[PDB]
Scaffold this active site. Sequence first.
Site, short mmCIF file in Angstrom:
data_model
loop_
_atom_site.label_atom_id
_atom_site.label_comp_id
_atom_site.label_asym_id
_atom_site.label_seq_id
_atom_site.Cartn_x
_atom_site.Cartn_y
_atom_site.Cartn_z
CG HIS A 1 -26.01 -7.33 0.33
ND1 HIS A 1 -27.23 -6.08 0.60
CD2 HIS A 1 -26.35 -8.20 0.84
CE1 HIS A 1 -28.08 -6.84 1.30
NE2 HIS A 1 -27.62 -8.39 1.50
CB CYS B 1 -30.52 -8.33 4.31
SG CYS B 1 -31.02 -8.35 2.59
N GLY C 1 -35.59 -5.69 3.88
CA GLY C 1 -35.15 -5.29 5.45
C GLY C 1 -34.84 -6.59 6.29
#
Lengths: 298, 305
Positions: A41, A138, A136
């Site tokens: 993503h 991820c 942030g």
Amino acid sequence: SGFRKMAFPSGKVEGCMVQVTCGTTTLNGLWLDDVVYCPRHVICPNYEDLLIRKSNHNFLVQAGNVQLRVIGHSMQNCVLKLKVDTANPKTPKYKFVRIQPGQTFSVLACYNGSPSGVYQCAMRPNFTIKGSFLNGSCGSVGFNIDYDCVSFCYMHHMELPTGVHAGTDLEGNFYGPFVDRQTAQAAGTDTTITVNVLAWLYAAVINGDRWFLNRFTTTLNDFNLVAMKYNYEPLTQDHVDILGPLSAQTGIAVLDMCASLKELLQNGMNGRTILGSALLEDEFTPFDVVRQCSGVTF
Amino acid sequence: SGFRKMAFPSGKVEGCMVQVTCGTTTLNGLWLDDVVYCPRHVICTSEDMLNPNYEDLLIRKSNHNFLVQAGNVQLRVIGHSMQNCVLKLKVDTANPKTPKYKFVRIQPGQTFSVLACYNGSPSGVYQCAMRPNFTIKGSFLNGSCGSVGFNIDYDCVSFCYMHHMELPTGVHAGTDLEGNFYGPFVDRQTAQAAGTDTTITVNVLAWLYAAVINGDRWFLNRFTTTLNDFNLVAMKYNYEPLTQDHVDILGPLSAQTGIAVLDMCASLKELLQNGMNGRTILGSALLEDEFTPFDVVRQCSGVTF
Ligand SMILES: O=C(Nc1cncc2ccccc12)[C@@H]1CNS(=O)(=O)c2ccc(Cl)cc21
Ligand SMILES: O=C(Nc1cncc2ccccc12)[C@@H]1CNS(=O)(=O)c2ccc(Cl)cc21
Ligand SMILES: [Cl-]
């Protein structure tokens, strides 16, 4: 003495964390050998169609204060694999493993490729994890250590509306019925990890907390009817076998300890605590109890 | 979202752990630059522990009596000195993995990460707090002596604790990195007991602010309290007195949530009176006191839910 929620030393994983930026999105990546692994993503959906428009130089990878040069890219399930020009000199001995619900692991929470904290958690029976993640995070990873080998088991992808987290193994396969998109997704009804609660009851006995023990034993059948009523996961013969060493160490049979859990479920703690907790703890596996009550080093 | 007991990444500290052996005793040491720091009781036998004369045991030792092992490499000891309850072993090699560091002495209520080690090998990391009675509720087995406590705010490691001993109640006692014990403890196997412990009030309040930031307000009430009346009630539940310094320190969390410190104090007063009534706060059925106001600001979002 003492019993704490203990994480593995994170050093071997810290030396692998990098920052991946694609356009306006910035998240974390795992740099192992000449490949950076991160959530797909970062390019955001029709992912293969979005990726074909990108070139290697669109991906900015930063390892500390050094920019790594992306020389290739490919997608594997929900993970993006960025081939870089430099192999990580800090790459440890590692494996990619997929864990089962009930198993625990350490999470090295990261922001901008910089590790900020480490905590221990468990893969819930509903496949979510109760983590501590902000925007942030991820690309932050979950792992275990076996001697010198780091087994990467989780990569963070998203937060669900109840504040719980969802992610994938390092091959990009999600844990649970989740997808990497902005859509209506909800965690299923969760259950308590019974084998883990029993292991923590054994840890309390080892540390000198025996108030909850009784003269009674029970059958696996009778106990599973009680477990089903209190939203506890069913206890299998495999779970009983796995608890064998702890049963032998304390002299309390697994079905003997099950009768203690039955009485704690039907009657509560009555103002008492077990290992400093007023709830029954289920995020310590039988192996975690054995390892912490006999100092295994890495 | 979420709120966990979070430890600092331990990597900078792992690269400093060594094994120190003196005769039959083996424990952990902290290798920073060309010095290895370890508990001075490494020079004692089990017999010596009753009334050890450390100065008399140390004068009988030479550099080559101390074996220091860093991974698979033996370090050569070229000097030794005692500073309070810490032994400082000068070695022939500076640690190439030495991070930016400071030695800091913490106050009760302060938290830190502990890297538990055995034989100079790190086995686990956990977060804990210096209790008001100066002990720590750690998880340590025999061989853990020399394991260290630290904070890594920004990129500098602040070493604040070195493990020395376990007390009869299962709690732990140790020193700062200058060898000064926290609490009225001695590195003697004499009758020593931890004082009656209390709850770290400023930390419980900080954790109540963390719950409000994460979207939970069930425990708030329409009441306020004076600082004195709050302390008169809190001390009946073995809570530490709340000082004006604590109220000032909670200022930013009060401004972020819009809940005055003394109004949060009133909510704490009611929680102590009523219990939780089957409810939890941040996944806990007890009032948590091992998160400081600074830890909450660090881990929680800057935007309240
Ligand atoms: O879930 C996501 N991120 C986050 C992860 N962990 C903690 C967070 C705390 C606050 C805000 C975002 C967090 C993102 C963005 N939110 S999103 O657009 O809904 C989304 C959807 C899918 C995927 Cl795979 C990812 C996402
Ligand atoms: O306390 C001590 N060691 C230990 C430290 N941490 C955890 C442990 C868990 C189990 C057994 C020993 C442990 C030693 C030996 N026992 S002792 O002779 O009482 C003692 C006394 C003082 C000093 Cl400075 C040290 C000691
Ligand atoms: Cl302090």
